[model samples]
Target chain A: DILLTQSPAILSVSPGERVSFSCRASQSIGTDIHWYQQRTNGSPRLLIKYASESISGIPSRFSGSGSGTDFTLSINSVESEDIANYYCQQSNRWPFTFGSGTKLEIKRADAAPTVSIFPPSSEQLTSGGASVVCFLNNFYPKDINVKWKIDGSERQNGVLNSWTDQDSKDSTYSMSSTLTLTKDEYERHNSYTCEATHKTSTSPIVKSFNRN
Target chain B: QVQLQQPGAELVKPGASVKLSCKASGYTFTSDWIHWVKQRPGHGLEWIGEIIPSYGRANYNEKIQKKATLTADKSSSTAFMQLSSLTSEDSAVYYCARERGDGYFAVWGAGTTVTVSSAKTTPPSVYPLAPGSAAQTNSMVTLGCLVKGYFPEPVTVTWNSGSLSSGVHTFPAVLQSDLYTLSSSVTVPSSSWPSETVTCNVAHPASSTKVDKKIVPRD
Candidate 1:
């Protein structure tokens, strides 16, 4: 049988929130589905099996249901400690397969980061030399990383700047990164993407621009 | 009191074979199953297969069934994997873990790293293409982002969109010359565009770098 497909891909919520994710099988696998939780940089741990049954040591807050082609893993009152990647495996047939994974993040109560991409003017881009800036604003908890990509190639040599809002009491932060491209590198129809990641989020906030 | 010990590492040439060993101790070896896992450099984990010691029964992933052979020795309490027709794609770290009665990997070995040389190493080019079909509602647009021209096997594709739900469907890479090609489609839907950008991230083993492409829809 094929691997199960997980929906939503990610579940972002604040503490004390309730959330549920689903795993759908390509065909009937009955109750042979198993659940696993993989912490960042840690090995996978078994959480539930045969649909709704729990393993020893797993908290009662974690529960599962359904059988055959449909299954669900539910969590009540999510905690920061519960943030991890959850995956499903099917053992009903030979050659077991695992789902892609569903990332669970502990959402922060503060405002989400806003991303803006400033592209070089058309005249400057036509000369094959241009610089682009990616601005991130209004984010709390300064832990973050920035990545730059041209078309699909990863690029280096970007300057990153960050500063805390000393004027504010909550330690809000803002950051920006600038990427300089050579004349030969700038072309019409080429795409550039800037990805900004936060400590409380599993997926990065991305902004893109195309040279026209 | 179960343990799994494996070799440190291995280096083999293309078109050759390598037999990896994993010794078990402190438990009834025949009473459990031994499952092997594969991890490429900078890539995610994959389940290779499992073998039951009590009997000589074995099961494998359809993709690698012919390429790998699983054998066990009851006298030595060791499990072995003999991989044939080695290529650069086969260069990876392998681990053997004890499978509990519930089919969980409760205990694992240190892991063995194998390297295959004399193969081309080039990263894939990932981008977005038009979708064959889409579903749209009053507030949301469901579209597919198609990616192509990737080498080797098992390139993971993902989509990133705020307040959006997405999933990926992949097609296995096929061999051509000394390289391979594969493709994937990321399905994403959203209530707004431009205001919320969509991205396709492709992770490959050929390099530590990941290819990120923005799916700019045609207005």
Candidate 2:
């Protein structure tokens, strides 16, 4: 078995700042290391594997370098959403072990996120399926947590994407969560709501809609 | 579709014990391994240990080896962890997660927060920080245990694993709002890293209280 170690208990930075960190193995574990990002209240997401190789769905901004005893994972530009705990693990041996974790936090002020939801905007209803967009805007510390509900019941048919405004000096962020449902299902389940939560807000911002 | 159900909260007195449970559903009861994790307020995650429900085999971090006991019942698909000789240091959110075949935990139960309060002086929050290694091209890898935020001025800190060359470093105690805050770190070689249990035991001689935090370097 190999021991994986990460440095700096925490890394505090601002938006657009570039950051890098290292993960070292106790022995010659080759390039069998992997990196994961764990958001405050979410599960771990594999960002890089085999030292510096890319994972299928991870963003290109994340990359890794190093093999054997020394490995480094770097982020080109730090976004508000990028604030979370990063961990390194060794897969070359059994009973895999993970590094303690380096926490990345953004140092900034808070801004309430604005949300909006639209139900199948008229002409698209002809497709026999309804598509809805839940948009969240002007939020900082990019870790946006969005949830969907149908008539008060929890739902999971939404796909979300977020980005920071590079043109803006404040590094404000925005995200859109789209939920697609068959026309029949959409018509039957009249009430659809999108709830967005961020650390800055005291409560979740919610928007509800009903198909016309 | 696998899911883990956990208790919300528990209150236990010091010198006592509490058993936390995680009920599993939508998966084969005995097919997967169940692992326990701990997270203190404002702290990162700590892997306590893991268990194979069907075979009833368990492996733990050396620090919690004597303090934590892992058990499961196949008929109910439930996993449980019992923390004994509890203290304020045990007050944290505990979670149970199912280990995937690929060697990572993808599903976790909502955590259970355990609070161990006593009439005696409060115990500092003690838990091991993630250990990191720095490999020297042809030499040894330096492994460090970055323990932090523990309170009271003079607590004894030591590496409880087998006899290994190690060094202990401490940060001068700084006064917080009311109590004191300090950190103690231990650095050892990679040889000491592979030990089943790499623990940093913090003991307070004034009260004869000992708080043990363990890390597992291997299976």
Candidate 3:
């Protein structure tokens, strides 16, 4: 019977720091190593197949290396949501065992996000709708939700949030959300609001622009 | 990747206790948190408690601490849960799950079904009805079977070898004096009815017995 041992048990890293993990087998099993990642409340999935082969739809930053008895899974510039549990498995033998899970922990640094709404410029309104972007900058831990509200009720459509972007390594994250509205749609509404809430959320930061 | 395997079903007495096994596989069992949960057929769910195999420690829900015990055998990569002082209220499917990041459960086991018997159990008696003045959109014959004097509200009704795809109606069980009675009827074409004998099979899990009520068309 073959056995796999994953190391460190738990590895702590800040967002954007590169991380490498290892799993050793009881005996050499060729390149049969496979990496699996399980997100919060999610089922486990194959992240790296056959040691270093890329999987479809996975981010380029997520990759794997190594073969035979020892295997490696790496994440370059880890995101907070990448804080998850990872395991390695081998298909070389009969039992085809899995490595003990390696949990990625985020050493969260608290930096509350700042919310700013960029009112539509004349050029933007000249084209089609009055599109405004709500920018949330420098929030640590990288978990946030951006919502647009007209008057009071929330609007689900015409709003899209950007992916994670940080200026440098070990820096807090930033995001931008665009809310598009027809010219008449904005003029008729008294208030257009942007609510940016970090997962740590020191009360949802609300910024509003009234074009009445 | 972790898998927790559980027994398919468990039958227990109302006053006694039941212990279920959760065999772990695919990953390390130690240092992992296995949380047990109780899920009702009515779609209700509640957390019973959690156990860490290597730590030999447990944390439990407020109401479950008195009724459940959590333990593990690291050598076998198995986590065990013993639920005591059983009752009809304890008749729920339970799951053992692997929780990481102190987050919600991501890995799960095929839940173990815990069936708590009533204070007393009685098997059902099946009665078949003979054809009488058959009538339908055509000459559809209505064959009837009655399952009576059964405890525990569940019973399986099947016609001949399997279930009827259509024209099968089963009445709700009426309970009185700690017993349940129900009736089911299946309608089939008269031309095919006399060619083959119709059998109504009733399965009673409380007594682990099956009764067949058959209508003889040839004899």
Candidate 4:
């Protein structure tokens, strides 16, 4: 299964500006690509198919180009209502996958996030494993990194980072990551660390989790 | 204080159907939302669906909407899920978790296992594991053995008895294709393992299949 990596996670621009979002596949997938538009509180709508083919009702301003390992989705003119997320999907392989969409936001100031890592769920711990969530709220320009360290050792095997989302009430984005530990690991380990890095902040906001 | 009691292990055949339950106790069952999740071995935790008994509304993961049904019984405070057209991929551990309206959110059940295979069982396939770049930063080194394609759960892994203390750690079984897979690892002092050879002994109670995979680590 090929993984798709999208770039410039948060595209901040003003009206009348032209922008293009890039999606790179881990391997060649030819022209079997699809682009989607996700408006505020709405499900994804396919705007471009087969890399560059047009979709009905989609404005002419939206177009796509490229194939194989590198692909692009472009907007001729960024509009106010167009402040939405654009996603890329590659279907040429089995277990087709999608990259977290590029959030096209209206030009705005960057806001560092408020980070918190909740206590481990005890009920889940009893089941041979457990999950702790690291939540980021009120962040801007959305691009950030969250990492988990167990027993003072960093691990990627059981970490799940959630997609960044915008909260309509405040316009600030919110996202979370879950670190799952084996029941035994949780018991033997005393300290669980969650560190978050954002451009707005000079340092990563680090938090820890445990049974207490 | 709230508790969720779900089903245990189940053995079903392909094309058959199965119903798992979650009986809630101690809380007002209808006051909160009850959700279901699927755990495939050591990975892939999916939110299968959610339910609100008081509102009489239920929803599912669009991918498996046609394959599942989420329901609840207000009188008994029990939420249920019925999966139809069972297949090999349906074999996994399912959990019933509750979402709270206030603090200390999420009450989870012990989880139930669904094994979609015939009464006839098969043995496990054991493979090798090795230490990676992370070895340089830690005091202890750990390596694993990949065991897959077996049934009826409860498989055991023991490090070759000549020298060990259950340095062994076994992860849950993950469903891959038509088989069940899991990983078991052994952690030892970094200084003690670089020159030592250890054997991963996999013992499958069913089909009485016992296999061994040797591990030789390099600094």
Q: Give every collision pair in model 3.
A: none
In candidate 4, what are the lDDT values of residues A14-49, reduced to their tens digit?
Answer: 657898999999999888888877654333466887
lDDT of 1 by residue, A1-212 (tens): 57689988878776788889789999999898888886543356778888898889999999999998999999988875687778888888766788877877665556556555555434444655565655565566656678888887777864434342211222234555656566666654388888888875789887776665
The lDDT of model 2 is: 0.66
Estimate, for each residue in B175-199, the C-alpha lDDT of model 3 and write its tens digit: 6677766656566787877577788
Q: Per-residue lDDT of B125-175 in model 1, one digit per residue for the tens?
A: 553443212212334333333333333444556667333333333333444
Q: Which candidate comes out best when scored by DockQ?
A: 1
Please, what is the TM-score per model? 0.51, 0.48, 0.38, 0.34
Q: Please estimate how well model 1 matches the true structure, expressed as its whole-model Cα lDDT.
A: 0.67
Error of 3 at B144 (Å): 3.9
For DockQ, candidate 1 versus 2, the one ahead is 1
Clashing pairs in 1: A128-A183
Q: What local distance difference test score does each model get? A: 0.67, 0.66, 0.69, 0.68
Give the residue spans of candidate 2 off by over 4 A: A12-18, A41-60, A63-65, A91-96, A107-212, B26-31, B63-65, B118-219
Going through the candidates in order, their DockQ values are 0.05, 0.03, 0.01, 0.02
What class would a CAPRI assessor give candidate 2's docking? Answer: incorrect
TM-score (chain A only) for the predictions, listed in order: 0.55, 0.52, 0.53, 0.53
Where model 4 places Cα greater than 4 Å from the true spot, the runs are A1-212, B41-43, B101-105, B119-150, B154-168, B171-219
Provide the RMSD of all predictions against the true structure, rounded to 1 decimal. 15.2, 23.5, 23.1, 19.1
Model 2 / residue B75 / CA error / Å? 2.6
The list of candidate 3 runs beyond 4 A from truth reads A1-212, B1-15, B21-36, B39-43, B50-59, B63-65, B71-80, B87-118, B134-141, B160-172, B187-191, B194-198, B215-219
